[PDB]
Write a protein that binds this ligand. Structure first.
Ligand SMILES: *[C@@H](CC(=O)OCC)[C@H](C[C@@H]1CCNC1=O)NC(=O)[C@@H](CC(=O)[C@@H](NC(=O)c1cc(C)on1)C(C)C)Cc1ccc(F)cc1
Length: 159
C-alpha cells in the first residue's frame, strides 16, 4: 500500500507524503507541463530546495492515504529503506545505512542531502523515497537523486 504512493513522474518517480503533498527529484519533474494529475500547474505550489522538489496541491488528490512524517534526513547510522520501483513494476526495497548530512557538489551543482551506503540504483530510479521506521510511525527523509560511480554511495536529497 505504501508502494501505491510511488508513481511514475516524468523520467523518474514521486511520492505522496499526504493526500496533498507530492515530492520528487528536481531532475525528474516535467519542465514543460501545464498540468499534474489533472490540476492546472498555476494552482500547484512548487518549492525547490536543490534536488528536493515539493508539490503542494490545492485540494487533496490521494484521499485514500494518510499524512506521513517528513523530516530533513535521518540520524546518522540509521538503516533506511530505499523504495525503488522499476518500469517493469517490480518492487525493489533496498537497505541503506544513512550517513552524514551535508551540502554536496554533484556534477558541478550544489545539493543538500544525506549520503548513504547500500547494504544497485540506475538513472530511472530518481525521485524514489527513503523511509525508516521510528517506533510505530514510518518517516520519510528524502528522495533518491544521485549515486557515485565508484562503490556504494547513494545520495538522498532532503529538506
Ligand atoms: C537519477 C537522475 C537521472 O537519471 O537524471 C539524469 C541526470 C540519477 C541516478 C544515478 C544514475 C546512475 N545510478 C544512479 O543512481 N542521477 C543522476 O544522473 C545525477 C548524477 C549522478 O548520479 C552521477 N553521480 C554523482 O555525481 C555522485 C557523486 C556522489 C557522491 O554521488 N553521486 C553519476 C555518476 C551517476 C544527476 C544530478 C543530480 C544532482 C545534481 F546536483 C546534478 C546532477
Amino acid at each position: 500500500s505504501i508502494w501505491s504512493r510511488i508513481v511514475n513522474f516524468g523520467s523518474g518517480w514521486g511520492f505522496w507524503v499526504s493526500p496533498s503533498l507530492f515530492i520528487t527529484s528536481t531532475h525528474v519533474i516535467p519542465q514543460s507541463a501545464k498540468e499534474f494529475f489533472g490540476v492546472p500547474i498555476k494552482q500547484i505550489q512548487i518549492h525547490k530546495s536543490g534536488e528536493f522538489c515539493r508539490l503542494r496541491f490545492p485540494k487533496p488528490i490521494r484521499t485514500d492515504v494518510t499524512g506521513m512524517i517528513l523530516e530533513e534526513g535521518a540520524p546518522e547510522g540509521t538503516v533506511a529503506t530505499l523504495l525503488i520501483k522499476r518500469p517493469t513494476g517490480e518492487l525493489m526495497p533496498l537497505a541503506a545505512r544513512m550517513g552524514t548530512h551535508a551540502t554536496m557538489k554533484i556534477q558541478g551543482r550544489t545539493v543538500g542531502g544525506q549520503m548513504g551506503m547500500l547494504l544497485g540504483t540506475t538513472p530511472g530510479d530518481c525521485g524514489c523515497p527513503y523511509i525508516y521506521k521510528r517506533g510505530n510511525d514510518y518517516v520519510v527523509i528524502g528522495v533518491h537523486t544521485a549515486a557515485a560511480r565508484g562503490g556504494n554511495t547513494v545520495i538522498c536529497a532532503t529538506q
